[PDB]
Design a protein around this ligand. Structure first.
Ligand SMILES: CC(C)(C)OC(=O)N[C@@H]1CC[C@@H](n2cnc3cnc4[nH]ccc4c32)C1
Length: 293
């Protein structure tokens, strides 16, 4: 008889599957030693009217990216960047694009627009996103101004989850093995000394991110710049031990210029040497809110 073929079933569009052929690169948003985030237009009509998206890929680590995708896909919060979908065969993560970029890009350019009150409002939003993440039993491990995105003058979102780990139920912390490219000038002593990551360790990192926000991410006042002044900039592989010693001695980043002492004191509560002595994200929120009203 006739050639037998397969009955074509009723195909449905998945709005979270982005086809490689319509995903068109515009420029880079960031990169590291294993990957990049690129600005693309998803342009199925081919007339440059498609939606702009942020696309996270790997350089020619897959498993970690798949885990990152699965974490972000299931986070829903107004201060966490929106998952849009994936592009696959290898995999790419597709996210909403925030044209203002990170606080590192935005703050140096917008000092006149963004006063202390707005900085404190950003600080609360960062804290709300982080408290949501902790409520889902995650530790972020990479909270820094470069990973905080600006949705508008009035709203920020946590914009990267590449190091985020689940803390096991009934456990207080996650222990990391892969630690080469750690952001050590953002890390709490327990992270540095033992590679143990608590929710309290994210509070510590928040305090450093707050210091960045308050300095408008000026490079000459960055956590790295200031610590290297405190400890010495030419110690190579002794850097972390000298960082740890400085922190053991009770030395901390200084009060930013024009930062009220009452804001600096909330910051210091993030930097208690022992995790259990640190403030919580909820208490930070309360504290900033008291300063705002
Ligand atoms: C280092 C690595 C390539 C792994 O990741 C990043 O560079 N991540 C940065 C965090 C925010 C990213 N970014 C910068 N401008 C952005 C604008 N919109 C964005 N949506 C999702 C991420 C994102 C943006 C880049």
């Amino acid at each position: 008889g006739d050639i037998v073929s397969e009955k074509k079933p009723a195909t449905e569009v998945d709005p979270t599957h982005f086809e490689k052929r319509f995903l068109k690169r515009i420029r880079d948003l960031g990169e590291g030693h294993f990957g990049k985030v690129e600005l693309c237009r998803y342009d199925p009509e081919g007339d440059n009217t498609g939606e702009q998206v942020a696309v996270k890929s790997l350089k020619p680590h897959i498993a970690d990216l798949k885990k990152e995708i699965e974490i972000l896909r299931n986070l829903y919060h107004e201060n966490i960047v929106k998952y849009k979908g994936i592009c696959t065969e290898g995999i790419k993560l597709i996210m909403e694009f925030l044209p203002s970029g990170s606080l590192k890009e935005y703050l140096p350019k917008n000092k006149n627009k963004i006063n202390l009150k707005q900085q404190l409002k950003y600080a609360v939003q960062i804290c709300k996103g982080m408290d949501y993440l902790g409520s889902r039993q995650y530790v972020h491990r990479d909270l820094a101004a470069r990973n905080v995105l600006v949705e508008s003058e009035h709203q920020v979102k946590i914009g990267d989850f590449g190091l985020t780990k689940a803390i096991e139920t009934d456990k207080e912390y996650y222990t990391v093995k892969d630690d080469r490219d750690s952001p050590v000038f953002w890390y709490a002593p327990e992270c540095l000394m033992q590679s143990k990551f608590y929710i309290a360790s994210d509070v510590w990192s928040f305090g450093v991110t707050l210091h960045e926000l308050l300095t408008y991410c000026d490079s000459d006042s960055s956590p790295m710049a200031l610590f290297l002044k405190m400890i010495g900039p030419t110690h190579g592989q002794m850097t972390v031990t000298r960082l740890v010693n400085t922190l053991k001695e009770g030395k901390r980043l200084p009060c930013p210029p024009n930062c009220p002492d009452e804001v600096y004191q909330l910051m210091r509560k993030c930097w208690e040497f022992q995790p259990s002595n640190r403030t919580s994200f909820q208490n930070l929120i309360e504290g900033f809110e008291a300063l705002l009203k």
